[model samples]
Target: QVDVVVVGAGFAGLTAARAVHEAGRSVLVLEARDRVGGRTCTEEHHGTWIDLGGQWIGPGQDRVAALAAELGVETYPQPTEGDDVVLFGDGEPQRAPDVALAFSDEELTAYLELAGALEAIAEKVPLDAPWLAPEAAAWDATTLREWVAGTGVPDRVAGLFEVAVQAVFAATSAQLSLLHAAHYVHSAGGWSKLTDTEGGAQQDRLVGGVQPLAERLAARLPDGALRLSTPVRGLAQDGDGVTVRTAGGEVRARRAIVAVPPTLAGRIDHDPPLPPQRDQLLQHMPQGSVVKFHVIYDEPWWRAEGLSGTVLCPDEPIGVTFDGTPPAGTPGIVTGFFEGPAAVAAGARTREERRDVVVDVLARTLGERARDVRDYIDRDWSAEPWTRGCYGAHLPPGAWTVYGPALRVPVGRVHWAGTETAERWTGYIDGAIESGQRAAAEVLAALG
Candidate 1:
């Protein structure tokens, strides 16, 4: 009935629908959740806003930055003003303005060497077709853990790399292939740009929350263009067009953009079924497990101690922490993550137990003032029915070489658009917007 039908109201889907509408095309967006924003959920606590999902914009992430500006949403730099806490093994916490300073000269050299090696390999990876790289087969066959071990770095040095892997991918090094890791690093420019706070992926945050971008996009559409609480369960594509079936009814459109993750996309019923390679790819690409949490305080007490509220604990249940305090007036917020295997372990415990573990870690890293929490809120992405996990999907040991080609390829009238399919900034919000724009272009071209 419409020119285009977009499924999922996340940033990707909503952006796609908006683009189609701007081109003077009729579009309908179907979202399962009653609210929009997909993986970017912002909830208000008392008078402050807390983001339960993806919320960050960095250098080189132009699409999202431009979108935010267009929507009249403002952004502020993430706080990185004081000492960073580093916890190594059972030793007392070490304080340094930069985490690398916490390490010995020798350890720092070894870690930098490892980073250089990764950067070199990443440079060889073409963001659009990583599997086509010269050593793609060998790299894809090797697990990141295996590769790091093969590098013969010291155990402590290797441990530092593991922490970055868990924090960035939300999965252990053993869970992803080396090829995927390099491609991911390259996608975000370099290892430092991907991990650092100043000019990196965690550089800035939206004023209210990133969710407002999606809300603003959805609001701009025609009155009946967007429908929440309508999950598309099936799609049947004929030579003429595609039919999307939801619990409510069926919607026929000239083309359909399925803007969900690969795992969720695989769950949808297709008339002729996805290609074997695509299906196999979906089966092999599993999402990274992560539980993101925020601990609120009356004020940023750590700042008084000349600490930036950033803690990196490689061996702990809460692998990392950052200053999530809102601009000047609101309560101070400390955001942290239980990633990879740690997330799996944390999931087994009750919320209160998880809170205790997070609080204990913060208290030890920051001062005792960290224990005086005002409120605690967390989101376990794996437990979300619509979104199985956080960050995005990663290829296993052999999945990339075997299935990477099928990643963004369209099937008949069903097009794919999500962070997972993005060639740049693959797992970030910027990538999601990039994918939506790309998918919209494809469908628009086809319609013309």
Candidate 2:
């Protein structure tokens, strides 16, 4: 029997297995998906590679960056050159110069002044992260609406920024925590850098392509160590060790690190079914955004308009738009996204039906040219068997209050480790690695 058996072959599982092995223990990793990379999968279409999930990386993600550096992998500076467009109420296209206007110097000066004041207060704040400090639980109870509203964003500016915030948080104004928002803003090197270009999303891909990195991860683990195409049905643990049952067989390990996403974690049966609060915490982990729709065309059509193919719809079904010019010149491939209940409903339709849904939204916003586009494909995170959603979102009110404590609590020998349990960059790749290493370290200490 191995010293540790890690379930789930995502970034978390892979990293956890590596850490355990480094600690002088034999490790085995089990994955539900047929392949590795978890949510970060790069698909090739029409001679171009596209990251269907976990696409962006910034300086804010130090762990991921450090790992890339160690692997001798370089990160290409993503071409973030594009104008900000918006879908007003129903996903109709509208050019929002308001984004540029609000980001002007006059407003920036006022925003910076508050940043200065916060910097003073931030000194005494816990350098670890806001969530780790329960004393700061007071922030979880607050809403960003109060701060931004009090900060005096005009109605138009408020609407504009709300779209941006909701785009990431995937929650409306009332549902988000201001403290979480503000802390995220501060931790990610300030508002502008965090917000992307012209106050939008930024894209970064590994120098060797995310595909190669994924290959390297799988290559490091032995064939028997990782059970591909073998999915774990349930897990039962006792004082002796843990029983991991799959279609192939079962193996017992002194400790099992569940590296699966919170959504599927609930689906699995644990011997005692962890404390209700633990299940509740998993249930309320919150996933931001539901889909990433990547559409590729034969060539760049928006170039005819001197536009960067950056079309934002103010009154359509799709909210965000971009010039998703691929690195290998994949024609007019513009990658975009959709979220919420609408996205889930779209999943019930046929492939063609889903393609039309995205097409309709894009055409309405970008005019006739968008209709000409074909080879449209949508990545619905909510529907993925392994990953129920894309990125980790802000927990609900009082939910954050339970997150810190619940994550630390162990279920027999099974421990929590994922971006959700990370100390910082909670929803990014960096946080995933930290969570794995931290949990492994904790387990090592406990064993001693």
Candidate 3:
């Protein structure tokens, strides 16, 4: 018997298992997939490497950055030094000349005002317990879209805001709760840092790839501690401890950490059903759909024209695109995202059809040269059984107040650990690691 059993080998599970082990406890990690990284995967294309899962660490995320440094993994800034494009409908794209990555002055003013309002709201909504806010019920009752639409912004700017929401959450503001959205923005410091590349969540990536971190984490644990392809199907707890029934067999532990996203966590059967609040919250917190694709070009051609290859195309199937060039500097890759409703529609089409749409978007937004791509790759996270969506899950109106307070609350011998359970940087790699460490602490304290 082990002291703890971690279900899921992603960042959260790996980090938690390591901590529990370091704390002088025997721990076993059961991963549903053959790989270690949960939402972080990497692949090689045309002699260039790319991440297919959660990648990026921005400002204010000291925990993840420190962890990377501790693990000896290096990071590099995102390529946002050149001109960025903001496309409006089908009209010609407008370029932002400044290298600082700021929008037009008029729009910037509105954006800053909006960001300030969000910051104020986020400040009021405590990250650990958002539902405990003074006016959480009223705030959660409204949707992000409803509030943003009434903010009195220009028509064009309002549409851009929608695109931004899609790019970030992979869902419309109408689908997300105001309180939850504010907490998300606050989680990453602010909306500006949440969205921007420079000093933001998309500011930097690992020097090699995020995949290596998971490998190293697993390597730190004792032999036979991490069991891949062993999905926990049933969990039961008694006075002594918890028994985790996996595809292979049952393992008894003093405590178990359910480290997968709430969406996947809700599927495992508990001997006694989860508390009403936890189960209800899991039901309300669903994954956000996104079709993330990357295109390999001969070189960083967009840089030649002083364009950073960052495009926001609200009218097209792809809402956002960025230059994901490898640091090796050989072939250039442009990453694009089809989020929200577009993802659902795009997921229905064949891969070749979707490839055509991505190429068409690159050609129109950048130049005809974008049409001649060397290697095209894409991953519709919604189709993945382990993780139904990309980025993370979102809370809808009224759900936060009615069901959110129980998000991180433990259920008997089971503790929660996922990006969603993190108090800061929720939905990012940093948050995942933070959640793991937090759960480990909880288990250690409970054991004592």
Candidate 4:
């Protein structure tokens, strides 16, 4: 038996296992997929690397930045020099600031006021325990969209806010609770930091690809430290240790870290059953939807037209786009996102059909020159078997207040570690690493 058995080889699992090993303990990692890096997949198209999964890190995400530096992984900035494109409800696409759309002076003022109000509410939410906030029940009972709709803003500004919410969470404001939304904003430090490209969540990306971070960590482990394609179906813990049951066989360890998203965690069978609050919370934490795609071009064509290649469309098949051109400069790439309802619609169609929809939107938004795309690749993470969605899970109205306490709490020898459990920068790579380290510390303290 090993000292620890880590389930799911995503960033969290790998990081946790690495820490356990560094502490001079025997650890085994089990992964359902044949590969590492659970939600972060990096693919290549026409000699350019494309990140199909979780990829950006920003200014305040020091945990991941420091981890990358230690791993010898380099990062590069996302292109955001020129004006960004904004398509407002079937209107013509126009160039504007990174966060500002084509709203009027009055609408912009209303939008700023709306942002300020939400920020005030979000500031009241403690990053670690949002459920403990006064009036948490009332806040959790209201959805972000519902709160905004009643805030007396112009309909146009409300639409812009809805798009911004979708871009940040990959789910509509209606699907997110006000308390959860506030906590999300507070976790990232503020609303502006969560959406800003220059200094926010979209600030930078890894040079080679994000998957290598997991691969390198896995390599550091001793032989038999990891087992891929081993789907863990059941987990049982006793006073002595825990047992992890997989399709291959059963393994025993002093502790088991289920380092998967909370939604996925609920899918596993527990020996005695988790508390009702924890079980219900996992049931309510549904994964958000997003369809990410990349297009290869001969050169950085958008720059010639004074476009930054960062396009945000409130209503379209392509909800957002970014210049993903590599530093090598051999082939330019543009990454696009179809979030929430747009992503759901695109995911319902065939690959070619979705590609056609995106191509049409790109041609219209950028220019006729966009029609000459050299290569096209897309990944609907919602359809992937191991990961049903991209980004992370979101709580519906009233769920967090009832079950927030169970997020990081352990039962017997079973521990949890995922991006969503992180107190800072939750749902980002930095958070995943932070949680992994936390779980490792938890296991070590218990063992000692």
After superposing candidate 4 on the true structure, give the runs of residues whose Cα lies further than 4 Å from its correct spot: 97-101
Ranking by lDDT: 1, 3, 4, 2
Candidate that would win on TM-score: 1
TM-score for model 1?
0.98
What tens-digit string does per-residue lDDT give for candidate 2 at 1-448? 7778887777777888878877787788888777787878887777766777776677667788777777676776655544444455653455443335325576545555554544443333343455654445766776767656766755545665555565565555566675566555554545555556532226466753565565576676666788777777888988788888898888888888888778677778788778888788777766665567777778766655545555554234455656666665556767766655555566666767867877777666556777777687667776777787777656665665665457656688888777776756666777778888887887777555
By lDDT, the better pick of 2 and 4 is 4
List model 1 lDDT by residue over 1-448, tens digit each.
8999999999899889999999999999999999999899999885877899998899789989899999999999998799999998899999998998998999999999999999999999899999998999999999999989988999889988899999999999999899999999999999998888888999999998878778997898989899999988999999999999899989999999999988999999999899999999999989999999999888888888999889989889887899999987458889989998899889788888988899899988997777788888999999998999998999988898888899999998999999998989999999999999999999999997
Q: Candidate 3 at residue 357, lDDT?
A: 93
- Candidate 1 yields a Cα-based lDDT of 0.91
Report how far residue 210 has shifted in candidate 3, in Å.
0.5
lDDT of 4: 0.87
- For this target, which candidate reaches the highest lDDT against the unseen true structure? 1
Off by over 4 Å in 1: none
TM-score winner, 1 or 2: 1
Query: lDDT scores for all predictions?
Result: 0.91, 0.67, 0.87, 0.87
For model 2, the superposed segments whose C-alpha errors exceed 4 Å read 72-74, 82-138, 143-152, 186-189, 197-203, 207-211, 313-315, 348-354, 364-367
Better of 2 and 3 by lDDT: 3
Model 1 residue 170 CA deviation in Å: 0.4
Please give the TM-score that candidate 4 achieves against the real structure.
0.97
The sequence of per-residue lDDT tens digits that candidate 3 reaches over residues 343-364 is: 9999988888888999888888
> 159-224 in candidate 4: lDDT tens per residue?
788878988898999999999999998988988788788879899889988988778878889988
